[PDB]
Homo-oligomer: A and B are copies of this chain.
Amino acid sequence: ADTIVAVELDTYPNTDIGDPNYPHIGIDIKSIRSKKIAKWNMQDGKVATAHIIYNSVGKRLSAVVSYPNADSATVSYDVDLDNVLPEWVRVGLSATTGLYKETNTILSWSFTSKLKAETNALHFTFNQFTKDQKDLILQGDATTDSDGNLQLTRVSSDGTPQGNSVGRALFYAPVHIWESSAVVASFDATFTFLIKSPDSDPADGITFFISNMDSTIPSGSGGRLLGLFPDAN
């Protein structure tokens, strides 16, 4: 089994697995049952920006999603991620649709990890994605579209979202998330994303996740499990 820490922009309330009754930004530590969620007013067809921030000192994982109108949801959770994740991880984004659907279009994604000036660093930014993103590991239905967008989940050539889709994109390089001689490890990610749904109910969301390097889509992870967990423990 994989080790996952994720920030989930969960668009669809699967009450049977813990979701509150609304679209929510969630922090998931090792289970889809978010440790802490916050109500997220999903704005259909509008570009959101998610920032995820953490440092080893503060031991607080935070996520804020905003929409250009200045609306945001935020979630923070105290967690010491060195205690959680292996040292090397890959970082990535996940999406699923299920019975309900949405585009899970990533417009841009940037990530910075620092292991501290005898600091190590990884930083990447995609403001554009290409037909053949060699530094991204595309899993499941993830593809880059004609528009330099990352479609984490299947969209018909007419960009109608498809259901029962799971996709992920991990950065090609493993990331050294916390070393035992490390004083401080911090990371921050940002991606902007377009969730549009013909459905008045979008499903299921997009995560940014940190996983064990080897992580692949868990069979069973479609839909509400956001391509991250093989079940909802």
Q: Interface residues of A: mostly helix, strand, loop or mixed? A: strand
Contact of A122 among B60, B117, B135 (CB under 8 A): B135
Count A interface residues, CB 8 Å.
52
Stretch at the interface among A63-71, A155-163, A215-223: A63-71
How distant is A75 from chain B, measured CB to nearest CB, in Å? 9
Contact between A135 and B173, CB atoms less than 8 A apart: yes
Contact between B49 and A183, CB atoms less than 8 A apart: yes
- State the CA gap A63–B58 with chains docked (Å): 8
Contact between B172 and A70, CB atoms less than 8 A apart: no
How many copies of this protein are present in the complex? 4
- Interface bits A48-73 vs B (CB < 8 Å: 1, else 0): 01010111011111111010001010
Contact between B123 and A70, CB atoms less than 8 A apart: no
- Interface bits A148-189 vs B (CB < 8 Å: 1, else 0): 000000000000000000000001111110010101101010
How distant is A135 from chain B, measured CB to nearest CB, in Å? 5
Q: Report if A108 contacts B (CB, 8 A).
A: yes
Contact between B134 and A51, CB atoms less than 8 A apart: no
Contact between B120 and A176, CB atoms less than 8 A apart: no
Contact between A63 and B53, CB atoms less than 8 A apart: no
- State the CA gap A59–B119 with chains docked (Å): 24
- State the CA gap A190–B119 with chains docked (Å): 11
What are 16 sample pairs from A and B whose C-beta atoms fall under 8 A apart?
Answer: A49-B116, A51-B57, A51-B184, A55-B188, A57-B62, A57-B64, A70-B183, A72-B183, A117-B117, A117-B192, A118-B128, A120-B125, A123-B123, A124-B173, A135-B174, A186-B188
